[model samples]
Each structure stands twice: as C-alpha cells, then as structure tokens.
Target: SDRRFQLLAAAERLFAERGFLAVRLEDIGAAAGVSGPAIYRHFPNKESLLVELLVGVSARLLAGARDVTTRSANLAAALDGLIEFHLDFALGEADLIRIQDRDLAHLPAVAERQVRKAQRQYVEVWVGVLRELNPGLAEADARLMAHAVFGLLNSTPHSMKAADSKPARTVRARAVLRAMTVAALSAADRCL
Candidate 1:
C-alpha cells in the first residue's frame, strides 16, 4: 500500500512538472523507489497512472465537499468549510492542479467523463451554498461566480511560490488565502 502511495505521489509531482505523456513509467518508478516490475504489479501502464491521479483527485474533492455540507451548521459555516478544504488543495496540491489544467484533454474518454461528473458535483456544492448565502442569486450567476472564485484560489500557487512574494508579510500563506477568500465570498454574498 505504501509503495502504491509513493508511486501516486511521485506521479502527481512528475506529471505536473513534465506532463502526462512526457513522464515515463521508469521515471515514476525511480522517483517512488519502486522497480519497474513492482510498478507493473500495481498499474498496467503510464496511462493507468495518469487516470488514477486525475480521477482520484476529482473523487476526493467531491467527497470533501460532501463532508463540508454535512458537517457544517448553516450556509455560512458550510461555505467556510469548503473554503478551508479548497485552501488545502490550493496550498498542497498545486502540482496536481497544474497537471489537470495542462493535460485533462489527454485523458481517456471514460476517465474524462468520470472526472467531469465528479467535478460537477463538487461545483454544485459551491453553487448551492453561495446561492443560499444570497437568496437573490440566480443559478447560472451563482455557478459563474463559483468558477471565478475557484480561479482566484487556484492562482495562489503562482503567487505563493514567487521569488518576489512579499517576505515582510508575517501571516502564513494558508491564513492569507483563507482570509482573503472568505472575505471575497462573504462580501460577494452580501452584495447580492
């Protein structure tokens, strides 16, 4: 199990950096400290590894959204939970996000459908909560705003890793992301 775990992590990092087709199984095996034979025992080929990474992340995000909806007390609390959950992705899974942006169209047809289905469910979480926050918000408009907010959060990787990112800021990146997004969403909710 641990070998498989390392293999997936290595694949995510390599696929994000070098792209899916550009990354070979041997490179992933070496990064995971697993031999080619061991890797074949887990995954049939490079395509399978890519499928796992993309599909796995999609499923995880939807599941996390479900958790937030169930665990929160109200729309306000639910939105906060989602914002925190997404920040974890923004801060920790930037590589995976980058890979998806660059290589999603490369996914096999069935895997692509699966990813889209999972992602739609995740997006619905935000649309529902945000709409609830602002009862006047239309479904289409709420969805558009959710996508915009996602882009804002996803862009953090670019800024957080920048050499010129403000060094004087005493706050950690996670806090800054959390605060800024919460404020943005809350203010948007108030405006509607």
Candidate 2:
C-alpha cells in the first residue's frame, strides 16, 4: 500500500509537470524508484493508472462539495464553502488537475466515459448548491453559472504557477474567486 501510494504521488507530480502523453512508465517508475516492469505490478498500464487517479480525485472532490452543500446552514456559508472547496481542490491537486485536462482524453472509450460521467456528476453538485443559493434559477442556467465559476476558480492554479511572486498569488486567487462568484451570481439572477 505504501509503495502504491508512492507511485501515485510520483505519477501525480510527473504528470503535472510534463502531462500524461509526455510521461512514460519508465519515467514514473524511475521517479518512484522502481523498475519499469515493476509498475505493472501495481497498475496494468498508464491508462489504468490515469483512470484510477482521475476517479479518485473526482470522488474526493465531489464528496467535499456534497459535504459543503449539506452542512452549510445558509447561502453565505454555502457560497463560502463552495469557494473554499474549489480553491482547496485546485491548489492541493494541481498536478492531477493538469494531467486530467491534458491526458484524460487519451483514455479508452469506456474509461473516458467513466471519467467524463464522474466530472458531470461533480459539476451537478455545484449546480445543485448554486440553485439552492438562488432559487428560481433554471437548471440550464445554474449549470452554466457553475461552469463559469469553475473556470474562474480553475485559473487560480495556473496563475499561481506562472507568477514570480507567490504572496500576491494567494491575494489574487481570493480576489478573483470573490469577484467571479459575485459577478456570476449577479448574471444568474438577471438570467433567471
């Protein structure tokens, strides 16, 4: 179990740095301090490894979002929870997130569909929370707003990575999240 976790962590970092297609099993094994063939003992192939990673991340993220939605007692709390959840997930799993976007498409049809489905479910959780925050919003409109908010939050990781100054990254991310949430909610209200 420890070795498996190590491999996953190494893969997460490498995949984040170079992307899925750019990374080979040899590279992962090397990073994990194992032989190339040894990787097969834990994962059948890169596709399976990626699938496991994507599924695991999706499940964790959706679970967090669900918990936030269910436990928050008011709209403000819910919004704060949502923002925190998004930032935490994006920052904590930066490499995995990058790999998912860049390499997930290379998966087989079945694996791809499963990952995509999990992603949709994750989005649905946000949509549901947004709908609760602002009633009278149509499902489609809520979904669109959720996606927009995600896009806004997702940029934080990349921006932080690109910026030379780290302190301002945190300040910028928070400001961007707040501004995007407020603007998106306003647009959602008007659309509704």
Candidate maximizing TM-score: 1
lDDT of 2 by residue, 20-126 (tens): 78788877878777655767887767777787888777877878888898898987688788878787777656666677768878878887887788789889987
Give the per-residue lDDT of model 1 (tens digit) for 40-151: 8877788888898889989999998989988899878898899888878876777877877888888899999999999898999889888888888789878977997898
Please state the error at residue 29 of candidate 2 in Å: 1.7
Show where candidate 1 strays beyond 4 Å.
160-171, 190-192
- In model 2, pairs of residues that clash are none
TM-score of 2: 0.84
TM-score of 1: 0.88
TM-score for each model: 0.88, 0.84
- Score candidate 2 by lDDT: 0.76
How far in Å is the alpha carbon of 30 misplaced in model 1?
Answer: 1.5
